[PDB]
C-alpha cells in the first residue's frame, strides 16, 4: 500500500551480501534522498542510513546505500545473524510534501 | 535544512508597536475580538507567535 | 534519549485513541515527537509531526483533520488523538525525536510503541 | 546610567539636607533595555 516498493523478504546466508531494492519515481526518490531505516523483531527501529551516504557511527561499513535516478539499493553485506529484521526505504516526497516509505522487507538468517 | 526549517519565529499580534531595540518574552495569546478570553488559544484571541 | 511512550490500547472500532509520549533526560521545549504508524507487511506510515512551540502541526495528506497532535512544555508530552477507528487503522504507533537543527526534521529515534488492534 | 557622589563627615546632624553644592560624577553604564516604573530600595 506504501508508495516506495521493497521486496516482501530477503534472506541469505551468514557472511553473504543481501540487497534490498526501493522503487519510485523522480518526485520523491529522484528529487530527495533516499534512506534506510532497520527494525529489530520486538524493538524500536534505529537509523541505518541517511542521506544515503553518510551513517550515525556505530553501523559497520558493510551497510551502504546506493541511489540512482529513480531508484534504491541498500546493500546490507557481511551478513550476521542479528541481520534479521524490517527494513524500510524512506524519502520526502514533493508531491505529498511529506514523509513517504516502503513497504518493507524482511531479512532472514540462513542455516 | 533537508525536512526544511521550521524553528525560527516571528510574531504578527501585538498590542502596541514597540521602539527600537525592543524584546519581548512572554507569549500569551493577544486578543482581538472584544470579548476577553483566558486559558488557552480560541476564539476572537490566536497566538501572537 | 528515554523515550516514554503509553501502553498498549484495544477500544474496538468507532471508539477512541489514547498515544501520549513523554520526553525524558532532553529538553521537550526543543524536542519534538512527530508520529508514523505501520501497517502489517505495508512498512512505515507518516501521520504527522508536532511544534511543541506556539503549537503549530502538520497531518498526513491521506489523513483529515480528525487526526489531533498537540504538545505540552509543562508535562513534555506529545498527545495524539485519531477520530478514526476502523480495521485498517489496526497499527503499532511509533513518535520519534525529528533528529536535529531544533528537531522538528526527519526521524531518528522512535520510541517502544503502542499497538492499537481495531 | 548611574552617577553617584559621596559627602563624608556631614554636621546636619537633627534631619535636613545642607545647604550645600556639588556635582556628581558618572560611575556606571549598561544596557538593561527592560520596562521599568517602579521601583523600591533594600534594606540589610
Ligand atoms: C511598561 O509598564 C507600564 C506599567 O504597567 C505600562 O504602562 C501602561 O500604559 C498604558 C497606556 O497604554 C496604560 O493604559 C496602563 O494603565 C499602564 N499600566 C499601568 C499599570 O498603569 C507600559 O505600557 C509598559 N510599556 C509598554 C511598552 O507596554
Known amino acids: 500500500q506504501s508508495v516506495l516498493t521493497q521486496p516482501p523478504s530477503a534472506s541469505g546466508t551468514p557472511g553473504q551480501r543481501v540487497t534490498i531494492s526501493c522503487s519510485g519515481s523522480?518526485?520523491?526518490?529522484?528529487?530527495?534522498?533516499i534512506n534506510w531505516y532497520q527494525q529489530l523483531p520486538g524493538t524500536a527501529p534505529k537509523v541505518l542510513i541517511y542521506?544515503?551516504?553518510e551513517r550515525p557511527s556505530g553501523v559497520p561499513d558493510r551497510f551502504s546505500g546506493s541511489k540512482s535516478g529513480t531508484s534504491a539499493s541498500l546493500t546490507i553485506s557481511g551478513l550476521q545473524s542479528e541481520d534479521e529484521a524490517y527494513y524500510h526505504c524512506?524519502?520526502?516526497?514533493?508531491?505529498?510534501?511529506?514523509?513517504?516509505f516502503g513497504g518493507g522487507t524482511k531479512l532472514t538468517v540462513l542455516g | 535544512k533537508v525536512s526544511g526549517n521550521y524553528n525560527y519565529l516571528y510574531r504578527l499580534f501585538r498590542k502596541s508597536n514597540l521602539k527600537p531595540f525592543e524584546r519581548d518574552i512572554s507569549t500569551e495569546i493577544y486578543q482581538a475580538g472584544n470579548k476577553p478570553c483566558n486559558g488557552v488559544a480560541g476564539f476572537n484571541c490566536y497566538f501572537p507567535l | 534519549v528515554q523515550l516514554v511512550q503509553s501502553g498498549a490500547e484495544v477500544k474496538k472500532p468507532g471508539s477512541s485513541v489514547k498515544v501520549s509520549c513523554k520526553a525524558s533526560?532532553?529538553?521537550?521545549?526543543?524536542?519534538?515527537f512527530s508520529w508514523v504508524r505501520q501497517a502489517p507487511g505495508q512498512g512505515l506510515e507518516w501521520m504527522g509531526r508536532?511544534?511543541?512551540?506556539?503549537?503549530?502541526?502538520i497531518y498526513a495528506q491521506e489523513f483529515q483533520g480528525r487526526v489531533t497532535i498537540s504538545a505540552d512544555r509543562s508535562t513534555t508530552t506529545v498527545y495524539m488523538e485519531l477520530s478514526s477507528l476502523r480495521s485498517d487503522d489496526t497499527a503499532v504507533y511509533y513518535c520519534?525525536?525529528?533528529?536535529?537543527?531544533?528537531?522538528?526534521?526527519?526521524?531518528?529515534?522512535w520510541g517502544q510503541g503502542t499497538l492499537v488492534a481495531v | 546610567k548611574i552617577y553617584s557622589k559621596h559627602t563624608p563627615i556631614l554636621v546636619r546632624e537633627p534631619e535636613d539636607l545642607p545647604q550645600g553644592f556639588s556635582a556628581l560624577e558618572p560611575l556606571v553604564d549598561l544596557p538593561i533595555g527592560i520596562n521599568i516604573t517602579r521601583f523600591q530600595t533594600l534594606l540589610a
Open positions: 520519534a525525536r525529528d533528529q536535529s537543527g531544533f528537531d522538528f526534521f526527519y526521524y531518528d529515534h
Open positions: 533526560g532532553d529538553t521537550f521545549s526543543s524536542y519534538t
Open positions: 508536532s511544534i511543541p512551540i506556539v503549537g503549530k502541526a
Open positions: 523522480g518526485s520523491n526518490i529522484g528529487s530527495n534522498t
Open positions: 542521506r544515503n551516504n
Open positions: 524512506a524519502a520526502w516526497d514533493d508531491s505529498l510534501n511529506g514523509p513517504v
